[PDB]
Design a protein around this ligand. Structure first.
Ligand SMILES: [Cl-]
Length: 451
């Protein structure tokens, strides 16, 4: 005797049609959709299509490679601008790698089938990749597949799940507590707790550690290192920022979600600047992705989503929509069409297509500030469009007194590359380079010319 098992996945001819943009959901954790991506790729190769797979993070890329073992898959790093074999190959890369190559190479191939995993990712480079992709689709040049449970425009915080979820609304501490939340530490399962910031996570995680819980923390910069540890069975809590909304799978029974995030905002009252507004309520899609960490396994029916407060769907002041346009306006096509945002995302910005386009040296500086300097899109756009060269770091010290960077109420002071001690005082202020200490550590390194 034998068990039926997941049946072979027959591919809908429609998904390979030019001008077709398919939205699907892999429904992970029920052991029913293992063969989908491998079937799509094998069928794509059968049709002799030039295929691109976009993963949101390196971790997911690596998981896909294992899932696709035996198929002719070639992982592409952002350290390489283009990689053309003579052979039948599927390119695999990060959302951000695709966008970066579109910005620094005239050799990006004419993929006619593009699969974007976790296509809800609202990182600017991801938003930009989606515009480019859907532009190519509308031109009849490609077919695309956006895989995600919360496609752009979705507004449902309590979508379908593989297994039932108990949605529980109760007060959740935003800072360390010492009494009154016994349900948090009495629970005997594993928990994923979404915090609005690393700082909040630090407080929560240290409180939990004082009770003896084993806690793995996750943020954007530690994710590639720390997430693999969560795949070990030795923890009580994962404390994570919203980086874990993009394909992070956890063998957990409970999510705790105060539904708070920080949002970068371009302030235009006075000198343009970017602050990290908040903590403010998440969008409904983000609440759905957080909750969607659990209720994945239909044999485990008592998973819990513990949440507080309601989502806010209006996020049109998010800096990412403008930053997406800064990237898109700088991607050119032979057709010379400037790509536009994916349709559900067009309403997020009133910017006129092309208004951020840059020319010549400025364009490569822009690209280099982001790639090699690791600066936010907004900040990189300001530096490059002022005519500054990648290497020229004077602007990090010539800002107004208000732009003085503090750490612990101490004025940051560093060594220029040339050997002078100067107050860190950037001409343009983007809170993403100074709010988090490790981000400040990287920005100092940049200002000092070691980058
Ligand atoms: Cl983060």
């Amino acid at each position: 005797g034998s068990a039926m098992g997941e049946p072979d996945y027959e591919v809908d001819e429609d998904i390979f049609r030019k001008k077709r943009l398919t939205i699907m959901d892999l429904h992970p954790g029920a052991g029913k959709t293992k063969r989908i991506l491998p079937s799509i790729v094998r069928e794509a190769l059968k049709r002799r299509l030039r295929t691109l797979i976009l993963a949101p993070t390196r971790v997911v890329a690596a998981e896909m490679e294992e899932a696709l073992r035996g198929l002719p898959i070639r992982y592409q790093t952002p350290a390489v601008k283009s990689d053309h074999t003579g052979r039948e190959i599927v390119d695999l890369m990060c959302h951000a790698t695709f966008t970066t190559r579109l910005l620094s190479s005239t050799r990006v191939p004419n993929y006619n089938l593009i699969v974007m995993d976790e296509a809800h990712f609202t990182a600017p480079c991801s938003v930009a990749a989606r515009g480019y992709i859907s532009t190519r689709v509308e031109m009849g040049e490609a077919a695309a597949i956006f895989m995600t449970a919360t496609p752009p425009g979705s507004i449902d915080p309590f979508p379908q799940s593989n297994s039932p979820i108990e949605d529980i609304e109760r007060e959740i501490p935003e800072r360390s507590w010492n009494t009154g939340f016994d349900w948090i530490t009495d629970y005997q399962g594993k928990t994923v707790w979404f915090v609005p910031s690393i700082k909040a996570g630090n407080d929560i995680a240290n409180c939990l550690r004082k009770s003896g819980k084993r806690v793995i923390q996750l943020s954007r910069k530690t994710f590639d290192t720390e997430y693999p540890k969560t795949k070990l069975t030795d923890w009580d809590f994962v404390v994570t920022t919203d980086i874990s909304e993009m394909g992070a799978n956890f063998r957990a029974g409970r999510v705790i979600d105060p539904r708070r995030c920080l949002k970068p905002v371009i302030l235009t009252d006075g000198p343009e600047r970017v602050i990290l507004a908040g903590p403010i309520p998440v969008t409904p899609a983000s609440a759905a992705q957080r909750r969607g960490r659990i209720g994945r396994n239909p044999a485990q029916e008592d998973d819990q989503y513990v949440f507080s407060g309601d989502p806010l769907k209006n996020d049109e002041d998010h800096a990412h929509w403008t930053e997406a346009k800064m990237l898109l306006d700088n991607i050119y096509t032979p057709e010379g069409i400037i790509p536009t945002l994916f349709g559900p995302e067009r309403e997020k910005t009133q910017a006129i297509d092309g208004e951020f386009r840059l020319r010549g040296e400025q364009r490569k500086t822009f690209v280099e500030l982001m790639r090699r300097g690791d600066l936010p899109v907004w900040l990189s756009y300001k530096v490059a469009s002022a005519g500054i060269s990648y290497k020229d770091r004077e602007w990090c010290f010539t800002g107004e007194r208000n732009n003085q960077i503090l750490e612990e109420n101490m004025e940051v002071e560093i060594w220029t590359r040339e050997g002078e001690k100067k107050k860190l005082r950037p001409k343009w202020l983007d809170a993403r380079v100074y709010a988090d200490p490790m981000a400040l550590k990287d920005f100092k390194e940049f200002a000092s010319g070691r980058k």
